[model samples]
Target: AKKVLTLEGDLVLGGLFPVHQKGGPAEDCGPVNEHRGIQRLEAMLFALDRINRDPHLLPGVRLGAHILDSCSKDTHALEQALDFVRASLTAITGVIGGSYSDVSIQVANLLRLFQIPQISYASTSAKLSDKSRYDYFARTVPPDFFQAKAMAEILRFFNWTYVSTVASEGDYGETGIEAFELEARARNISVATSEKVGRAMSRAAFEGVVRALLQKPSARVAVLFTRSEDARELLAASQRLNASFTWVASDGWGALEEVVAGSEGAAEGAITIELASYPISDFASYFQSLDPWNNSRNPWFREFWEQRFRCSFRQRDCAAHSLRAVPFEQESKIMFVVNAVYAMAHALHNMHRALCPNTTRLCDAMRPVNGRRLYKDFVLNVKFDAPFRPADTHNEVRFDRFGDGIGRYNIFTYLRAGSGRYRYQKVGYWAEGLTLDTSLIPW
Candidate 1:
């Protein structure tokens, strides 16, 4: 039995969407700019790198990966990736890491245009998987459709009826944002404001968006969904306007410690909802590995504040924000990508003897192998289903209520430090209908 007889296939796995373009300061030390969204690119790259390194990661075969930054802009950077595929005989096999919904849609169109297969780690816009698109792209994260549905449930559950939503323009923002309003309406909730920010907004331009959320005067809850840095500015503006409302942010900005830091004291009552699986929710041993330095200077997060970007504490608050500690980049991006790679490669190994394994065959056959049955194995037992995202990928994203005595948000209201100061707290989540499931889906 020539195990992985199709193993020598070289693949170019790319996500080149830099957080600078995707979310960041775009400077020399740019990070994942779009909260968990921006950080995912790094995780995808690390997983690809790990796949290439593990000799048996794919039984009977070794895979080599070439990663580049695509930036989500319609520029040469993205096309160059296609060029790589073209040079590889349009057989680059599978393209991964195409981040933003817009960029994913664009690159996905190109993949179908050239008949390539892709698996995106980010890009939540549901319509990207709409009928017009061909059948190559797959993702692990739930689409914005699920997010919108979840947002509505959370909103209604919280008893927030009169609300406002400020979503960024374009399909990514508009689709999910509108759903929030529609669902709010169906639930008898009144949407006081619906605003749009430009594709590129300056700090003042962002402030203008906040003003739109505030225009209603009677609105009590503002659901702010935008890029990574802009939401921070929006909150800062809300503080200046003395507008006290329950500020709810999207998963796009939910997991960031920076938002709390950037908001100064204004983020006290802000609640954000995002798709995530915080590492604290799993493997108790991981918590025992951290170095504890409980200092009062770092007060609110005093127990866990080891460094600005590093989680120095051994234990994490499972009830607060979805901050998963992934080793490759220490973000959820790595957490999911690493698992997706393993699941995909394992499927190839299991199917190796029968099929003529190539990028196309891998894509064609891999989907079923990763269907509901295999997805259970991947996510440690979770059920997340969207039209295009793999069921296993869906399993990785967990939802939690933020700002409750029972939510999984990292930011906390530091009433003691004065309303101006916000602290990072690990209040537990009252999240239900989701738990770590270990049973494989019955085949």
Candidate 2:
């Protein structure tokens, strides 16, 4: 019988991920997409495996993961959340992982009625930090409030007195850019242009936004506040007209491979802010041993195998491909995802200890746990050492009063290698004290 229970979203194991605009269903309840999000999902699984394998984690219990795909749609996300509600699992870990802010908001609202704890790995909208409204929601990813300030400091440090800004139309983009503009204005940096790109807009409309912003002579460095696809359209437009400038990217598409491919040579260089991550030796070893035929439990195994080998299940060649370690450039953001899972495991462990102090009975005896009681007892009291982050071997991963994780970020650049490989190069860092470390980027 399963002892520890968990459920997640944003794996996007099915459907055509990185959804195409205009053609795809408006609210199809389907699969996922990611860069940092994928890495986080990988880490989440790895962390769950770690917890079940390590004797020190849950002692006599095993941690189980039930991951779903939100397909970046609010309606789909709500439908996915309903699955957990209808399940009869022994214990619900109460950790719900989501990728985007909009999706997280939808899931959080539904789960709040049932008192399940929701933790987003990449949903950083400032509005999610509102404890009164979202008491059940928490996140391993820091709020956009901090990211906005970090971006402002980056601009000031570079002494780029004038810049253009583009953001998606929503709470995530709107509030983030708002916070950034406030800080940029305080530091005397003028935003020469500000534009909003709608998700449902036609390619021509996006191109028009790009053209309008580029029309500003001082828009040499464009601050983009949307997802990769929007950024790609802007980049493609720039290439069509032979425009030249630097692009400042948001975390939404910073580490995405397609973003780099789509924006290939579209700018002098792209500077981005993302959650800090470092190599995890154990997970790297695990990544190399993946096999679809053997690890049939993984929903993504067959898809990954087919994609990597370019062969379908009908072809025997698919099973013959040798397993190899994906380079660091290939699987960045694994650490942040691991932390998100670790946070839940540690919280569950703490709850067990508190409820079963004498070891006289199984923690499963406490089944049908109250969500609010679980949150106040176990989730809130959790404090564990982070596996990898900010290069800190001794850093602790704990939730704040508002259910937000320790705020730390990395400002890095993805440099394209001639061999078609890519690696992250750090330029600056944002620590908890709102401190900025700069000068690493030559630009």
Candidate 3:
């Protein structure tokens, strides 16, 4: 059994993070995914610590957490989410994650039954915005609906009238590409070919996707709405067949070095849209300060430490390696994770103000906070400065009627970085509209 990280406090927030990548048919989990997993999980803990230390917010109400690993699988996420339902008898007020759309969708269905409010940091499938089906669900990142529109607008900007489309087989990719095709059609951009990559897809099937793209030679630009892993496989397949294209990718392939690590040539000249996020200096410092020896409270830290440095703690030869020695960039979605935690805290503060009045402690009315009331009254209307950028007016955090954040995305283009390598360079952004500096784009 996996260990659940718990911290004792007046109220507990449940968290679902995919700390490990999806495993083989026989295993339930695989290796640690540092960027998407440990960084995100630590970001939530960072937010919780910041909130608990603040005297102004949730006075006398120390927020705690019960965090679980989803292993990037919906079924695994559902199993972990059940822990929240089981802990509902106490003070599990809200949940903070389940990064993938399918995972969020599955967990949302169960959480809604318990009336638990679930806020996601990633999970951008457009279908999640349907309040009828996901009344208790909200997210810090905008839904894929806006992202699809942005992709269409980008194509319109580049005047690419015909393109091939590829999507992974799930809510994020299927719904995203569906919306993208709709938007593209509205702009008179025709799809030359459409393909889907599945989790259990055979290697031959991957090459077939490349063949499909090649069949429509006129569509040299391929729009990919896929998970990073799927994108990696597709890129490799395309490279093997000597098929090349100017790839226009969704956030699923955003600036992730892993996707291009082995297929840099195939990924070159790619333009990707990443959710608008900035690295937080405070979080960077916190992350660098962490040591597996001292952070015993985080059960997974030692494993992460070993995996990251390629050294075994038991061998005692890892003293030369430290987190500070490595690059200190925070995960791109970490701001959203911080924002999600703050949203929950603000909602709880609002509840306290209404239910407890001037009291510093929780009133009987807030003992076991009403999840429905919390969702309707506080979560829906939460408005605060973005946790990392308090003074920046443009960075305010709020949700629309559909419980979606502002549609903001940063556009990145993969350019050669010498020695047959490539790097993502920000060329422009999309915020309900496109603003691209074509000069920055090589192709």
Candidate 4:
């Protein structure tokens, strides 16, 4: 009997995680503590697993993923992406992605040589939207322009005329704050103070900005456009001095756990901006009980387990390492990550369906899926209703000419909980319909 390849999926996806902190090569971000990156990777893995179990999505096929760590550096990202490129040459890799804008740009540039489709869940730099340059790059998240506009609108809604701006020193922060300032000035809002803090800023430099903001009584409403690490540092300074000001947060640190962790009420009641997250139906339940033992192929699982438990797998008790206690909503980017993964799945599912007419069987897994052919023939045209919506009756995941998805921004505030932990309260949102809802917000 000629044996069929059981659960052989047509596409193999590659995922990149900045599992380590944005520091030197030796600096481990400790996967468990770096909740955002860990959960983002888990969300992708969970979606792939769920799709594999579903007979309707890709019947007679199973999904496989090759996850790698970018270490939040261009050099590391290039290394990981080259590995994907090597695999894509023989093994079928329909799509490859998952990282920051800076890192994604590096990977996108390299992947363009091979014409592999690269989709980003969280990268939002406006530069990535240049289709003429990055012909092969696509992202599930909207570009930073949209976020800047949303931030401006939020400022306008609050009627804050004077504000301070602290954006990180990078393309993402620079361009995003530029758009924001453009909109803010257009709307007659004054940019009282603007500071660009780098990743390796000296303590004196960081504290100087903090002291300046504290002294600038006119600019009480400060708009922070920085990442979690920077935000955490600034929050610590604020905590020390007990500075009082309203913070309008960027997506980078708005929903970040470390930014608010152990702050001692320093960053309480601040409005944080994020992409409007549609529920992933039942992803929370799936994430609650994820066992590392069951997912041996996942490279990060062992490290994640050891980090969380403080024990090595060689220890007999370490065999039962479970993420059952970990909550998905601890960070807010889970839906975006899931959406990115599903976006690829939908495109692949449609591509396979098109290739194998009237058959549930996928294209032969032994043969590689052509990256350029897949991008032009299927990805360019594939439109599935977003996972948050049914294809029969809702908006679809139609990529713009630049391969960016339609997006909306949800406004959130950190609220004091009886459990002594802060929770994300959905205060308002900026919808794709151009509607603003701020009734739920108090500030």
Candidate 5:
């Protein structure tokens, strides 16, 4: 049979861990999703279309996207994704992602079950890979372990020896924050106070907790691990409380732009910690093309999508169903996912060629393509280890500072611009969404 390559991923609305959403259940700084996820996914889709259109990038092969409406939480959502893979997977092979890290771990297990290959494009948890030594899981982002170090580096440089840690009480936020805190503690920094707020917190309640958290004395920074809106709420509350404390956030809250629209005066001096990317300044042409022709997937997306899905897409429902950020969101992590889908397709094709020799064993081929450097898009050049690779994942991380809604991804490398003591961009990338310090102050 002509081999068909299938890639499956999920987008869980309320997962154990939260990505950089504008607003989430806990609080609303603005829209829970400012279109980041949609944009990145669209870019990947575009890349896939181009790859397929080319002179046989896959050579008699094709690509398929199995988009899943991941259940509300990690457990159910993961199972839902696995069920799809088992039902449709012919020679199951390379995989891209499903948002949350906790969910990624379970999905990786399935890869082991199927003896296929999969990569977590945005999963940054350290334990997901460490939990099982299976070669079936490769995470494109650096693990929290490396990212924790990046946080330490940032804290160390600023002389912020004591910081407060406040994270969403979820796997991604909690686990990563704790790891980062330990890393900071090992570096001799103190994690002043640690607390967590559950999902779907009321704004007043959230603001109350954050305000209470800021009351800790001698706390230099608020190590945040939640949605950008949560961070913004904290900022807004902090400013309202007239708390002059400096703050920090992981890649999850990469900037103050979208969330910090009104709290500029308060969040003005605070710095955010994030996995770095090509700076917006460096990519003028790329940024200019952003949101081309107001490419948002509002009613406009419904115009074409109604045809694709073969259903009526009301403006409200279309906004809900259209990929999170049809235009701009797709570009958020343009390089990361954009290359991921294309590379995955390529890997499946290569695997098919190797395994079948004269035929297509598309999905089965990834098991052997385990560790080969994939050169495309934002990634300078790297390889995919069977299941996954730790180093390549580390290379995928970088850090940046956020000023306002419009955040830029600067390569957190070449410290002091060409000075010695350079630990490289690897430092920044791994620390995407983690915390770094945890010690209560005596003052």
Candidate 6:
């Protein structure tokens, strides 16, 4: 019942993560989303732990967290964000997370009323960039504006003049698809059919969309700006309708295995955009060391352990299971999560030096920290190299004037491995421009 995780310290930071999937009409949340939810939540904790252990950052001050689950729904996220307002009544200075753009938008509106600085790890809707509306909001990930341009560049490279576009109904999908449409029009790319998948769309509706997609027989390319779950449903519908396309997907589909799990046939030859990131081996080791027996601080860890390993602690059979053999692939946005935490830490540290001067501890000026000042003076200016950044690469993490990060994306295409099996192969990359290897792409 306790969905909140709290740790007491000199400064309390807030976090909102969708640890569970969206539930049915009757429930607020469904099953655990291990990859998108738990992995990201732990990344924040790992970053916090690392920051706390490093005596150089924040000196004598310990950063605490009051993290809550957003349930992957905007309304539920709004409800959970109220807790941050209450937490701010105590000592909460800033907040992190709310993975979806819609959730972040909703939380941003509420948090801004109290001047609580909010940062996102994965929310990428371009609407969030409007500083006048969401001044206290910032993100470690780039907005969909750049991603839309990248998609357009891919279409141009393929010489695909006509295509069908499908967008899931919400801020993420709708805004993203709109941006792509603008880019598409400028490139003389004609949209054959544009469809939308509602939050509670019926199975028949999905089939209808697939039928519309097939209406343009020559338009073999289909662009999808959809959530991974919705994309899976659409692919399933396409399979049933015997419809297939060379799917051009956005970051929403991003090399996620779940999107094409049961619908590999329809998803083959699909190209997806993934946020560029490097795997943090330190975080991987930290994750591998977590066990239900030793980690009681996280309330959901027990359930994740049981579901992940298919064994319960009460049964005492989990010790026999080894996680080393399994490929522990880090989520792409994990580095962004680390960056978000570090941004907050650096901001707080900078504020400490400015306000507290020579004092090693939290001075009176730091008590009830000014969130608005923190945003304008510190959070907006904090910049550092991500822990996982390779020495040769110039991957400095920082926010632009619009509160969006310096954009970079990796392009992946799904290739058939064998019967009913597929693998994502990196074929290209996008920074300010697109760089693709035509030979690597499987068409």
Tell me model 2's lDDT, rounded to 2 decimals.
0.66
| TM-score of every prediction relative to native | 0.66, 0.86, 0.96, 0.87, 0.65, 0.96
Residue-level lDDT of model 1, residues 1-443, one tens digit each, is 00000122443344434443433335232232443433444344345445566565454355444445554454434564665356535235455556566667767677665555455555667675563563555565556655665566656766788888878677677887887777667888888878887765776776677677667878878776665556766767766766566766666665556665645456665556555544422222232232224212112222222232444344654323222353322453444454444445544444443443553334544432332323222322222322123334533232111100112222222222335444433322224332211121110
Tens-place lDDT per residue, model 4, 1-443, is 01111123456677776666665435533243346666677677778878887777877767777676776666666766666678535363645455667888888888888777888888888999897778888887789888888888888877899999988878788888998999889989998888888867765677777888877788888888787777788877777777877888888886767788777477877888987666566666666676766665555666677877788877657765556654446456666676677776777777777776766776563245667766666666767666644234565666777788665887888777678667667777776533444555544
Worst 10 residues of 1 by lDDT: 399-408
Model number with the top lDDT: 3
Q: Write model 5 residue lDDT over 141-247, tens digit each, in one string.
A: 55655555666667776678988887876767888788878878887889778877676666677667766776787786777666555676776776677766666
Which prediction has more favorable lDDT, 3 or 4?
A: 3
lDDT of 4 at 52: 84
Pull out the clashing pairs in model 2: 12-31, 12-32
Model 3 lDDT-worst window of ten: 387-396
Error of 3 at 280 (Å): 1.6
What local lDDT does model 2 show for residue 104?
A: 81
lDDT of 2 by residue, 1-443 (tens): 01122333211111111121123544462233434433455566677666667777767766656666565655555666666555532234475567667778877777787777877767889899898888988777778878788887777877887999889888788888998889889999899889998857676786788688778987687777786567777777777677777777778766566666645666446787777656666775676677776665556556656666678887576777765744445344566567767777677677667776777334453564566866766676778778644453776777788888666787777566557655456767788544444444444
Q: Give lDDT: candidate 1, residue 1.
A: 6
Count: clashes, candidate 2 = 2
Each prediction's whole-model lDDT (CA): 0.50, 0.66, 0.89, 0.72, 0.49, 0.88
Candidate 6 structure quality by residue, lDDT tens digits, 206-299: 9988988888899999999998888988989988887879999998889888888878888889989998888775888888888766777788
TM-score, prediction 5: 0.65
